[PDB]
Tab-separated table of N, CA, C and O in Angstrom:
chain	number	residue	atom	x	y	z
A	1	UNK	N	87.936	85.097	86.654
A	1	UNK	CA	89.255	85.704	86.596
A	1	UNK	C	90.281	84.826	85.901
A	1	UNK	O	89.949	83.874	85.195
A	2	UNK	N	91.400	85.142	86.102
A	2	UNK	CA	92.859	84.274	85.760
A	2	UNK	C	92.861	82.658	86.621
A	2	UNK	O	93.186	81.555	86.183
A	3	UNK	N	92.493	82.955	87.628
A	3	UNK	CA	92.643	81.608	88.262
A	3	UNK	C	91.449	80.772	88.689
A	3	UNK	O	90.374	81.372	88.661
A	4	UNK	N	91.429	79.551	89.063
A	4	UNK	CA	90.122	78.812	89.187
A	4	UNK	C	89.578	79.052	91.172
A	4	UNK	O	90.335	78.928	92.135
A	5	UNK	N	88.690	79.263	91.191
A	5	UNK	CA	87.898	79.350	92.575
A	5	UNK	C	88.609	79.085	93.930
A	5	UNK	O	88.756	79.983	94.759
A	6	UNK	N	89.021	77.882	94.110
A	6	UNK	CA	89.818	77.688	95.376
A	6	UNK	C	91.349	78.447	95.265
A	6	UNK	O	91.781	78.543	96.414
A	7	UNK	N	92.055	78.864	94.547
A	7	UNK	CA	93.052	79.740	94.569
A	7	UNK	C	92.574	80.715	94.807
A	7	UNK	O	92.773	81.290	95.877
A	8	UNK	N	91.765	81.201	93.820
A	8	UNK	CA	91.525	83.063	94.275
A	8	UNK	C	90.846	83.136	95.467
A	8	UNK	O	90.777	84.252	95.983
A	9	UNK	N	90.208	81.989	96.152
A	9	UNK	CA	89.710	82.457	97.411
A	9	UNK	C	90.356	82.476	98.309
A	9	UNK	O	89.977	83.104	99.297
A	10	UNK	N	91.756	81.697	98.308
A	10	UNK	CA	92.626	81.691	99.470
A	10	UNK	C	93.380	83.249	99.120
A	10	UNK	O	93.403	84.241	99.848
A	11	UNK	N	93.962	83.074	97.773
A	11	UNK	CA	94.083	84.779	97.550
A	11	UNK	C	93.363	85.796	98.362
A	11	UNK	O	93.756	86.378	99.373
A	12	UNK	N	92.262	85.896	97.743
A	12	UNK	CA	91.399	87.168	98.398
A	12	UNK	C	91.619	87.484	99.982
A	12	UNK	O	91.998	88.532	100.505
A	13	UNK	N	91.178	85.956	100.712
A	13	UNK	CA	91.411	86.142	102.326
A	13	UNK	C	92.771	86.704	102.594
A	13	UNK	O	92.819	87.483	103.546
A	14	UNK	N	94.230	86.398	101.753
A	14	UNK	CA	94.928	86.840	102.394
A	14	UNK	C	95.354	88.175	101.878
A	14	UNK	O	96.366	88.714	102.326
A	15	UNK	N	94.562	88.770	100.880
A	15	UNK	CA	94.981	90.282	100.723
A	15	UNK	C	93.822	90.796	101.467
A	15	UNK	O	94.061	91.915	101.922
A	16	UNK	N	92.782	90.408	101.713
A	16	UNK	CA	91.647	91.159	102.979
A	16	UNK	C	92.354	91.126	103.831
A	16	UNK	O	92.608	92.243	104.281
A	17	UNK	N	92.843	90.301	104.317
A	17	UNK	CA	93.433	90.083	105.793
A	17	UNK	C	94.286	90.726	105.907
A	17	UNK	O	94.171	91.339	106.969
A	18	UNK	N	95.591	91.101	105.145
A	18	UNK	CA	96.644	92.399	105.021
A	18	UNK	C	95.780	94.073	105.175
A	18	UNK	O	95.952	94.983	105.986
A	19	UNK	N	94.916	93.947	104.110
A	19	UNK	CA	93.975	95.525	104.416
A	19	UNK	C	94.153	95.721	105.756
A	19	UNK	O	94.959	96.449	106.336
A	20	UNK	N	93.144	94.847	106.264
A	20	UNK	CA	92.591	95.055	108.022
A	20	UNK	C	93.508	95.249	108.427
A	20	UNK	O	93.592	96.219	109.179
A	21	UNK	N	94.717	94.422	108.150
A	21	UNK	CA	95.995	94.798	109.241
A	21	UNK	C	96.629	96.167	109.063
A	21	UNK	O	97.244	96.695	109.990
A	22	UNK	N	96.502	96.671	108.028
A	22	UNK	CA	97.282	98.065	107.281
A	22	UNK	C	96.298	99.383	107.653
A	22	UNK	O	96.538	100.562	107.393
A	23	UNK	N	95.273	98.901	108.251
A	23	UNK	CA	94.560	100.062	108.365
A	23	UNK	C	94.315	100.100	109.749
A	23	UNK	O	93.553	101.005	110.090
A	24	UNK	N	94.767	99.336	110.689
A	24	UNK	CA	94.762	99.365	112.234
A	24	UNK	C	96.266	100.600	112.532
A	24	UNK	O	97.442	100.751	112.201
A	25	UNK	N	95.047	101.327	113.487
A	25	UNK	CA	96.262	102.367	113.792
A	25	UNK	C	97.738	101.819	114.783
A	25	UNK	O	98.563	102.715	114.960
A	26	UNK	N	98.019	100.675	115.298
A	26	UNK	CA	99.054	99.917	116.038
A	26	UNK	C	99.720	99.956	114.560
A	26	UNK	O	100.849	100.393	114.783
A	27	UNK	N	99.627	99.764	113.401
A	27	UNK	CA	100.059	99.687	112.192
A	27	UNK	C	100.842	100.627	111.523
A	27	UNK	O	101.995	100.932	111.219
A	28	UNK	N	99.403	101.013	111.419
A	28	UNK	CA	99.596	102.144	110.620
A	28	UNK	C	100.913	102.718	111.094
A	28	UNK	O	101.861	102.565	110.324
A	29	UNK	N	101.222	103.624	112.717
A	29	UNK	CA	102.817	104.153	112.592
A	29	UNK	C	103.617	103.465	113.136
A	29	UNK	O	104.033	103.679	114.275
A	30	UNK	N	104.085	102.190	112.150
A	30	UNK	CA	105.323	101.601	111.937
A	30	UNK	C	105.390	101.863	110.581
A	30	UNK	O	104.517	102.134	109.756
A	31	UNK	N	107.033	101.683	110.478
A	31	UNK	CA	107.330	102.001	108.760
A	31	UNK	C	106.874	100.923	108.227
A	31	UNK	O	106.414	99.947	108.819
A	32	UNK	N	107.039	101.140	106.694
A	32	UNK	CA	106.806	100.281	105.832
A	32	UNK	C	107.304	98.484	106.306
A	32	UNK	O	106.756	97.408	106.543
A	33	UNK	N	108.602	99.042	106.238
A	33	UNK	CA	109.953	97.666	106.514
A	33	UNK	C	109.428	96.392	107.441
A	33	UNK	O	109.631	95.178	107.395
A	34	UNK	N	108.493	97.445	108.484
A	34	UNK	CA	108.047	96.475	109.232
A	34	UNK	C	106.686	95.653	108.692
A	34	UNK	O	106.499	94.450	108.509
A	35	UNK	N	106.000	96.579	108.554
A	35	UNK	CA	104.729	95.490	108.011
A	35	UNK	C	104.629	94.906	106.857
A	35	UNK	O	103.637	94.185	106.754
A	36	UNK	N	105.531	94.984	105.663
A	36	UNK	CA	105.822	94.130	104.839
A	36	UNK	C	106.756	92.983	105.237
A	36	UNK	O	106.818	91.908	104.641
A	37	UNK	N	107.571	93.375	106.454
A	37	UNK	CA	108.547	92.007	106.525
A	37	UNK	C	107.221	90.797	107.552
A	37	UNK	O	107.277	89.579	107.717
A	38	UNK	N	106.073	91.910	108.088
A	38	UNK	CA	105.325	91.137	108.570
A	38	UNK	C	104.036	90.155	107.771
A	38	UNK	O	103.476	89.134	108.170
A	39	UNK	N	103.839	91.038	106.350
A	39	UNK	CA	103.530	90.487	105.911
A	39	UNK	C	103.518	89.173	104.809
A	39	UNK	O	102.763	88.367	104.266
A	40	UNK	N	105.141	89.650	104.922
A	40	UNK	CA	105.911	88.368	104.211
A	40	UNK	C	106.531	87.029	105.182
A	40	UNK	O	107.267	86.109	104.824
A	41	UNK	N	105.895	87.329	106.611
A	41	UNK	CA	106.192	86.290	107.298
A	41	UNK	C	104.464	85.556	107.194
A	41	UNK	O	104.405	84.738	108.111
A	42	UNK	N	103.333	85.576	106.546
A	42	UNK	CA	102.075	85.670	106.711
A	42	UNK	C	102.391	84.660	104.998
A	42	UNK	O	101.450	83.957	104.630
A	43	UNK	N	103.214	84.672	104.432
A	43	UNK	CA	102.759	83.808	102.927
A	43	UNK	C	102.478	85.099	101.982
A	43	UNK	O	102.839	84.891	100.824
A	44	UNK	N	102.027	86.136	102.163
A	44	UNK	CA	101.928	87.267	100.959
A	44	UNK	C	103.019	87.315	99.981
A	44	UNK	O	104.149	87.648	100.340
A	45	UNK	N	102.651	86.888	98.312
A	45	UNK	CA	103.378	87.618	97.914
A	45	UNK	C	104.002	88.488	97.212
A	45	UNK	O	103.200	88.532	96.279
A	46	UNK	N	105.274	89.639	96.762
A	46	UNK	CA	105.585	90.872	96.923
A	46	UNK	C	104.024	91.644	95.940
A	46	UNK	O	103.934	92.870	95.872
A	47	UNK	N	103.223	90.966	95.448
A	47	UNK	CA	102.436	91.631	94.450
A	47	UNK	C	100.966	91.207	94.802
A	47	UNK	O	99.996	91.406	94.070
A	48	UNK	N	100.942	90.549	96.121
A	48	UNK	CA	99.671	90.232	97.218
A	48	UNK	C	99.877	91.657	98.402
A	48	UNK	O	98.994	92.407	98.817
A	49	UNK	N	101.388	91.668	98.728
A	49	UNK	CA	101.189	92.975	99.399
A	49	UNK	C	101.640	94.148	98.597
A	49	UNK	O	101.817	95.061	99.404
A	50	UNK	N	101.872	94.498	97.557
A	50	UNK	CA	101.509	95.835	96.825
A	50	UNK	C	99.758	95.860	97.042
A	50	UNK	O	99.158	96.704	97.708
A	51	UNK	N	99.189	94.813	96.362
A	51	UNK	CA	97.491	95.174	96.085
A	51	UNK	C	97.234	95.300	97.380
A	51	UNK	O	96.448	96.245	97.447
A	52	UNK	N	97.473	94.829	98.622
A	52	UNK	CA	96.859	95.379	100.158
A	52	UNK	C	97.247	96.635	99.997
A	52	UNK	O	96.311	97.388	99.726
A	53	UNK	N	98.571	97.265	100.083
A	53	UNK	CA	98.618	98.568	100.206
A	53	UNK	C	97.691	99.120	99.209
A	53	UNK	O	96.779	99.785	99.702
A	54	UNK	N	97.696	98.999	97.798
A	54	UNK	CA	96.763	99.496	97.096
A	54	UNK	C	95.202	99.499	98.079
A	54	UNK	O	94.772	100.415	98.780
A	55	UNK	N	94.920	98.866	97.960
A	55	UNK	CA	93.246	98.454	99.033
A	55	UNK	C	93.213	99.235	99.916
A	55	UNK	O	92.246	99.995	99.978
A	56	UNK	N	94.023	99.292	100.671
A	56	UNK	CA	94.049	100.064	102.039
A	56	UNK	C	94.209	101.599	101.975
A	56	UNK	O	94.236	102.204	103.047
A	57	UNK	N	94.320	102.308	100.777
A	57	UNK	CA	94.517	103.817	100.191
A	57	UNK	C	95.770	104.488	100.521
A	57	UNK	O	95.922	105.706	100.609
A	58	UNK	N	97.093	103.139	100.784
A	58	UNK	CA	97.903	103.624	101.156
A	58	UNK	C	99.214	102.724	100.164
A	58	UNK	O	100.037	101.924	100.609
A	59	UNK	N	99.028	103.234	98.582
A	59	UNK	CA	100.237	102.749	97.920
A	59	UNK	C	101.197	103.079	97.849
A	59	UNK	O	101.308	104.278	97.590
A	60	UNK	N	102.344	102.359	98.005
A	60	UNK	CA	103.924	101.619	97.637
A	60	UNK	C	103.973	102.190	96.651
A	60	UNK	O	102.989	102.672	96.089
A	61	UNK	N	105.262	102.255	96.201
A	61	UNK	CA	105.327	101.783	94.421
A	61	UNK	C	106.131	100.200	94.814
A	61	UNK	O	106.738	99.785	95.802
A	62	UNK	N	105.758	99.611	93.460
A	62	UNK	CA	105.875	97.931	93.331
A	62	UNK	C	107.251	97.768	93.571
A	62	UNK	O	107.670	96.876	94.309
A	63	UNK	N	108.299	98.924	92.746
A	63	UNK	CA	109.960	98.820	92.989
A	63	UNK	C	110.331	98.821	94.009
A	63	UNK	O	111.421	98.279	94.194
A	64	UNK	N	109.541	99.486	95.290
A	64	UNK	CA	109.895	99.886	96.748
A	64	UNK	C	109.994	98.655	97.405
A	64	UNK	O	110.881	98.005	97.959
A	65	UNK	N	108.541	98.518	97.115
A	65	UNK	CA	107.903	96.620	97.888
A	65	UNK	C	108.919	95.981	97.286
A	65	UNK	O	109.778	95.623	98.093
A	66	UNK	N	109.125	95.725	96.241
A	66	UNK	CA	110.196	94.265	95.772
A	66	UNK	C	111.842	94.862	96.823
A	66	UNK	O	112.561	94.047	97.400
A	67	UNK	N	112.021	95.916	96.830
A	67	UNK	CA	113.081	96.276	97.719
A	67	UNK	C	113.433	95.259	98.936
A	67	UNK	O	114.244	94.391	99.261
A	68	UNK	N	111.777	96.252	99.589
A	68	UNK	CA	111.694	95.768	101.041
A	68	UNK	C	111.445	94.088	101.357
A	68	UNK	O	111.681	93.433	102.373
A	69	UNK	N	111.103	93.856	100.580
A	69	UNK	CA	110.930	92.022	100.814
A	69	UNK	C	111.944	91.417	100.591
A	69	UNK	O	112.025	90.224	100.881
A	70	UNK	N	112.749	91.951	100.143
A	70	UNK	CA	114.461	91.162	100.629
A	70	UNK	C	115.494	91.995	101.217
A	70	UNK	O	116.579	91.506	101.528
């Protein structure tokens, strides 16, 4: 890819680790606001949690996410 091995692997774990969380129904019905401000307390960022929502079959648009993270 773009980056060398030990980056993209810490990458990967933490957009897997957003999926799992986005697809747990305790999750799932909270709004957006919340689990992005949760996932921006986690190190994600705004374009680590667009691609979770992407992953999880439940996309944002990217303008929304950059919204909600500040």
């Amino acid at each position: 890819g773009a980056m060398a091995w030990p980056e993209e692997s810490e990458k990967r774990k933490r957009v897997s680790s957003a999926v799992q969380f986005l697809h747990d129904s305790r999750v799932k019905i909270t709004p957006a606001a919340n689990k992005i401000q949760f996932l921006k307390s986690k190190g994600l960022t705004t374009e680590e949690v667009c691609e979770a929502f992407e992953k999880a079959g439940q996309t944002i648009p990217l303008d929304e996410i950059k919204k909600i993270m500040n």
